[PDB]
């Protein structure tokens, strides 16, 4: 368990020169009671959203950089950062899902596409960083230089081992890389690969059955770009690439499986066709599934959870969108590994004014997360996240991870093109029930647009630093400590009137121009 | 009664594989308590309007299309859809009242007109769709072709049976339709109808005393447009027309009486003059009456209710406007068959800031409907209905039907013309106390304008799909089940702070553009 | 389809070089939108009546006569300064609401 502000302060006093006190209480020192407990804040029976309250500051005895952001995504998946990219077609295809997994979050690929398109986008995420490359691009020596350029333009891989048959089930005869085809003139689609490959007698190779680390040290000291791995009869078993050692050095938080591939999630619906779609995604090596619906407490979703759990029992499933403990119960009881929380919040949404249904998102995160922790189930807080203060509030109220749409929209890794709407660079961002993309067919989203924010790799470390500094002013040394302080009543809250929200912002300045972060 | 979310979920589990539980309670399974009951929401003693609360989502085990929207309008009238057009001069003359009754609602014709104009607009509604046409347009053969074109331009009917004397009580001698006068040149007002009519020896006719379904089958297999009905002495009793079989096929929800005529309501005031008006409206065949006043709990209105009930005892009467149970009591006790609820809500209204009187419309619907169900009396929620979410909320709080002004204004079927005011197409919409149309003479309305929305026949199925999808996310199979869940405490509500209303809308998008429905 | 963008009914209208619907590929159109105008069968007779009344006020019995007066020098023109374009519009009214045509 955590240690109290009184215990920490008392310990820092015991580290310096500055009796019967331990006998009166002991460890439980006096702190004057101020603000509300989360139990008391929500006992009010009014719909509170992230703007309607504040967190009171604590006691600081660590630097903001020591703050641990490690988070459970599901019963069995842990991420080094609380951040998830929302499965929408204007937010997350493979470029976004790679960028989010590299910065220590995850992406879920959207399903407003064909089953084969979605499984191919998952396959692009899983192939980006590698331990042993077990299914490399291999060519036969009767091929041309034109084939090596076409392979580079079709996959993107310039380093191609050459085996006799042209598959892994064969003897290695050489390697072709970019540096031995790059200078060739346009007399390409004539020249055979035996004329250009570095031949197998010149190669540094390692014997099959080496661990990934032994093989790393062989490749590392060899100064080569690739290391082929070969069996006792001299056949090609795998390759490894120094690029992945560079990627590893460059991204110390990256969310990876045991094969050193990035983690990827995907969405599916609750139709019969989603059963086939799920089979392609599991063949593509997907790590976790979202069941992606406005109202997840349905007989159709509970059927699809039981189907996934009976067919792919090692696969992780997140139950859909819920806002009440009564909804969360039937999906936790159906056997989900996590839940998505939010309905009608979300910047592009109109569900509340179309359907009458929804809930205020601070209340929904608190009520669903307080119910879900009784069973050990993690919560994703989804939509309404406009600031790093909303992320810190969502995490403080009991969410394990936060899922963002509009905050990640109009980054360089978000799908589509910029188009410069109205004297601003301004990219498109639509919602999935938007009727802009897909019997009267009612809309539930609004087909809007968002300002440019540059790369995820520059914007997510701003989120991480904001969350860590928020935890430091609270006095929480990790996100697990922050939630422990909240359920214990140590974390205190204050409500805001309207004027309190106004004085928290920027007042009667004439001009106003904040710079978010400077590096 | 109705079956609960716990009972339904348990039943859907018993349809598959996935004990003391029945002995501990049985049927009343555990659901965690979350949100407020309607009785607890309104116990707050604060004026809540449709924007200040949300409905929490339930359990789904049916498709949204199964949702039954059948509603009581009065103690004795039932409509296949909850929707009513408000009796205002910029909303509802006969074109609107026909369009609303065809889509399974009703219209009440406005009274900012003469008694003879209002009775003629009712008569136009009652004539649009027909079983037996019992007093058809008839001519003598001694009329001219010019008289048939004049009849077509004065009534709108082309199929004119010809009887000797020229009335529906004389020997049939032929029929004239459009196809036997349409090609005639401008030598019209000379030629006798005997020269053009299909003669009685050529006609398909049916014997008087057939049922409507027997006559339908005879007309149907004949492939003619009309079927005359004739008695033993071969005089014209009635006609039927295949055009009405097409109307019946084309509009499966249409609100019809036993004679297969559309239902129509009308407004009258509480002055002594309104008795003559009421005589003419009942002559025209009107089905139901509104008594149309800002404050219905008056001695004048209670007089007029007693007069209508003593004179036309089969006629249905709706009480004025009320917002308190103390008002509702004296009108229910005077013997009304329904109540109109709302005062100072309504988009064009200023009565609250002029008179100091009114009530917040969510509270008023709840308090009046909760009092009125004790006596079996239906409620109309009137005014403030800006969205399909407001309709679902009004119905959930206990209204049986919803009456709309500004939402139906600036459709094609609403009275007046468009006039393109300020770069927007903008039809007129005014309120009935506008002083634009009806001592110092104080105004209570504001003479504004509303954007074009096309046909009622395209816009009402959008309302219907929105209400059905709203019921589906709530988990209600019908509007009766929705109100039963509300009075039982199964239906749960949350209040909204102002920031909760903000996050329910559209956030910091730059551009924003929602298509409401796609077909 | 109409899509109701900002409290106005709002059908789409683009230009054929708009890069919205078709090497740097330079764009030459802008992909805007236009307010609802109803049917061609109701709007074209307003155009026809406006053209006929314009010809009548000019004194021309047909469009061939109108062009014949122009090439002959019988048809006369006046230039407009900017203030002349302003007085040809609607002036210092507070509210303004023209009905185009009414059958
Ligand atoms: N979280 C939100 O607040 C929210 C709100 C609206 C839409 N969305 C998103 O929009 C997208 C579309 O999903 P959706 O929300 O329209 O719900 P959905 O696509 O799951 O279901 C749409 C409709 O079909 C029904 N349905 C689903 N599976 C069915 C089955 N097997 N048989 C019969 N009927 C079935 C549902 O009950 C509902 O009426 C998703 O990305 C979703 O997450 C999200
Ligand atoms: N519901 C609302 O919030 C609201 C508010 C204002 C107006 N309106 C509408 O505008 C219109 C006018 O409303 P109104 O209340 O002015 O109509 P009204 O005719 O009831 O009011 C007429 C005035 O004279 C009185 N009066 C009515 N009958 C009388 C009689 N027999 N003898 C003597 N005095 C009599 C009334 O008490 C009132 O002061 C109606 O269409 C009504 O629905 C609605
Ligand atoms: N070839 C290869 N080796 C890797 C990769 N990622 C990690 N390794 C190696 O596996 C061992 C793992 O050590 P770390 O990299 O510190 O830990 P990690 O958890 O695997 O990855 P990070 O979370 O990125 O630090 C080291 O020997 C690494 O060189 C990769 O993508 N490819
Ligand atoms: N060569 C190769 N790399 C693969 C393959 N599958 C995945 N990769 C990854 O792609 C990267 C290697 O790309 P290469 O084309 O070989 O070139 P590189 O060595 O990265 O050199 P640069 O691209 O110039 O930096 C590594 O991160 C590999 O893990 C494959 O079949 N062949
Ligand atoms: N002909 C006729 N129709 C009547 C009369 N009263 C009501 N109607 C209705 O008026 C409508 C028009 O009738 P007609 O003019 O005969 O033409 P129609 O048979 O509907 O066929 P259309 O020419 O396609 O409109 C029908 O829907 C009838 O139900 C009446 O006296 N004569
Ligand atoms: N002539 C005529 N027959 C009708 C009309 N409406 C229904 N019918 C007939 O009445 C009988 C009952 O049909 P239903 O399917 O029950 O029609 P309905 O419920 O009365 O009316 P809808 O709600 O319009 O379907 C059939 O013989 C119909 O053809 C009508 O307006 N005119
Ligand atoms: N394991 C190996 N043993 C021997 N030679 C190798 C081995 N792997 C690659 N080569 C050869 O070494 C040279 C450089 O290969 P490398 O993979 O580093 O090239 P590259 O990735 O195209 O270089 P660059 O990064 O500059 O573009 C090539 O001639 C290539 O065929
Ligand atoms: N019951 C009948 N028996 C015999 N002939 C009939 C009968 N009813 C109509 N006719 C004749 O049949 C012809 C077509 O009549 P119908 O009512 O179908 O025409 P219509 O509705 O005016 O045609 P349209 O829809 O094309 O405008 C006319 O010559 C008409 O006089
Ligand atoms: O069209 C839509 N209507 C309603 N909710 C949507 C729609 N599309 C996505 N959402 C939700 O909006 C969330 C993103 O909200 P945002 O981060 O505030 O922009 C998503 O993760 C979904 O839960
Ligand atoms: O002039 C007026 N003043 C006050 N209330 C009016 C007036 N005319 C109509 N109303 C009310 O306004 C309702 C329509 O409200 P709306 O649907 O919000 O536009 C009507 O059904 C009447 O109850």
From Swiss-Prot, chains A, B:
UniProt entry keywords in alphabetical sequence: CBS domain, Cytoplasm, Disease variant, DNA-binding, GMP biosynthesis, Leber congenital amaurosis, Metal-binding, Methylation, NAD, Nucleus, Oxidoreductase, Phosphoprotein, Potassium, Purine biosynthesis, Repeat, Retinitis pigmentosa, RNA-binding
- Which reaction is the catalytic activity of this chain? IMP + NAD(+) + H2O = XMP + NADH + H(+)
Q: Where in the cell is it found?
A: Cytoplasm; Nucleus
Instruction: List, alphabetically, the Gene3D superfamilies matched.
Output: Aldolase class I
Q: What class of enzyme is it?
A: oxidoreductase
Q: Which residues carry this modification: Phosphoserine?
A: 178
Q: Which residues bind NAD(+)?
A: 292-294, 342-344
Q: Looking at the Swiss-Prot or TrEMBL record, what is one Pfam family this protein matches? A: CBS
Principal localization reads cytoplasm
**Which tissues express it?**
IMP type I is the main species in normal leukocytes and type II predominates over type I in the tumor.
Which GO terms fall under molecular function for this chain's record? DNA binding; identical protein binding; IMP dehydrogenase activity; metal ion binding; nucleic acid binding; nucleotide binding; RNA binding
Record-annotated residues binding IMP?
A: 347, 382-384, 405-406, 429-433, 444
Swiss-Prot/TrEMBL induction comment: Constitutively expressed.
Q: Where in this chain does the record put each CBS domain? A: 132-191, 197-255
Q: Which family does it belong to?
A: Belongs to the IMPDH/GMPR family.
Protein purpose: Catalyzes the conversion of inosine 5'-phosphate (IMP) to xanthosine 5'-phosphate (XMP), the first committed and rate-limiting step in the de novo synthesis of guanine nucleotides, and therefore plays an important role in the regulation of cell growth. Could also have a single-stranded nucleic acid-binding activity and could play a role in RNA and/or DNA metabolism. It may also have a role in the development of malignancy and the growth progression of some tumors.
What does the annotation say about its assembly with partners? Homotetramer.
Additional notes on this entry: Because IMPDH activity is tightly linked with cell proliferation, it has been recognized as a target for cancer and viral chemotherapy and as a target for immunosuppressive drugs. The activities of the antitumor drug tiazofurin, the antiviral drug ribavirin, and the immunosuppressive drugs mizoribine and mycophenolic acid (MPA) are attributed to the inhibition of IMPDH. In addition, bacterial and parasitic IMPDH's differ significantly from mammalian enzymes, which makes it a suitable target for anti-infective drugs.
Protein name per its UniProtKB record: Inosine-5'-monophosphate dehydrogenase 1
- Provide the species name: Homo sapiens
Which lineage ranks, top first, belong to the organism behind this chain?
Answer: Eukaryota, Metazoa, Chordata, Craniata, Vertebrata
């Amino acid at each position: 368990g955590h240690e109290t502000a009184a215990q920490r302060y008392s310990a820092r006093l015991l580290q310096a020169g500055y009796m019967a006190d331990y006998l009166i209480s002991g460890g439980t020192g006096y702190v004057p009671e101020d603000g509300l407990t989360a139990q008391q804040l929500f006992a009010s029976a009014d719909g509170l959203t992230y703007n309607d309250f504040l967190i009171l500051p604590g006691f600081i005895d660590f630097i903001a950089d020591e703050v641990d952001l490690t988070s459970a995504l599901t019963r069995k998946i842990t991420l080094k950062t609380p951040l998830i990219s929302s499965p929408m077609d204007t937010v997350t295809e493979a470029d976004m899902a790679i960028a989010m997994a590299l910065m220590g979050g995850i992406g879920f690929i959207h399903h407003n596409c064909t089953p084969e398109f979605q499984a191919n986008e998952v396959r692009k995420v899983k192939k980006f960083e590698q331990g042993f490359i077990t299914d490399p691009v291999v060519l036969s020596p009767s091929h041309t230089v034109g084939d090596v350029l076409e392979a580079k333009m079709r996959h993107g891989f310039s380093g191609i081992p050459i085996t006799e048959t042209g598959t892994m089930g064969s003897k290695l005869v050489g390697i072709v890389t970019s540096r031995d085809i790059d200078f060739l003139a346009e007399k390409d689609h004539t020249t055979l690969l035996s004329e250009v490959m570095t031949p197998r007698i010149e190669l540094v190779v390692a014997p099959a059955g080496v661990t990934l680390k032994e093989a790393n040290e062989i490749l590392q000291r060899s100064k080569k770009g690739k290391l082929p791995i070969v069996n006792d009869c001299d056949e090609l078993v795998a390759i490894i690439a120094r690029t992945d050692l560079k990627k590893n050095r460059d991204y110390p938080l990256a969310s990876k499986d045991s094969q050193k591939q990035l983690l990827c999630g995907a969405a599916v619906g609750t139709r019969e066709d989603d059963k086939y779609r799920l089979d392609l995604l599991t063949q593509a090596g997907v790590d976790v599934i979202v069941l992606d619906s406005s109202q997840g407490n349905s007989v159709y979703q509970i059927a699809m959870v039981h189907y996934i759990k009976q067919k792919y029992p090692h696969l992780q499933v997140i139950g859909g969108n819920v806002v009440t403990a009564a909804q969360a119960k039937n999906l936790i009881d159906a056997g989900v590994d996590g839940l998505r929380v939010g309905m009608g919040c979300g910047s592009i949404c109109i569900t509340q004014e179309v359907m009458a249904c929804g809930r205020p998102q601070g209340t929904a995160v608190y009520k669903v997360a307080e119910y879900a922790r009784r069973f050990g189930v993690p919560i994703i807080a989804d939509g309404g996240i406009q600031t790093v203060g909303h992320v810190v509030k969502a995490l403080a109220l009991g969410a394990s991870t936060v899922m963002m749409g509009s905050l990640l929209a109009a980054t360089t890794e978000a799908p589509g093109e910029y188009f410069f709407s109205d004297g601003v660079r301004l990219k498109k961002y639509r919602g999935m029930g938007s009727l802009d993309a897909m019997k009267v067919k009612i809309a539930q989203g609004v087909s809007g647009s968002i300002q440019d924010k540059g790369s995820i790799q520059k914007f997510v470390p701003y989120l991480i630093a904001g969350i860590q500094h928020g935890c430091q002013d609270i006095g929480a040394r990790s996100l697990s400590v922050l939630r422990s302080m909240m359920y214990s009543g140590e974390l205190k809250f204050e409500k805001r009137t309207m004027s309190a929200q106004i004085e928290g912002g920027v007042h009667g300045l004439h001009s106003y121009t904040f710079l978010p972060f400077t590096k």
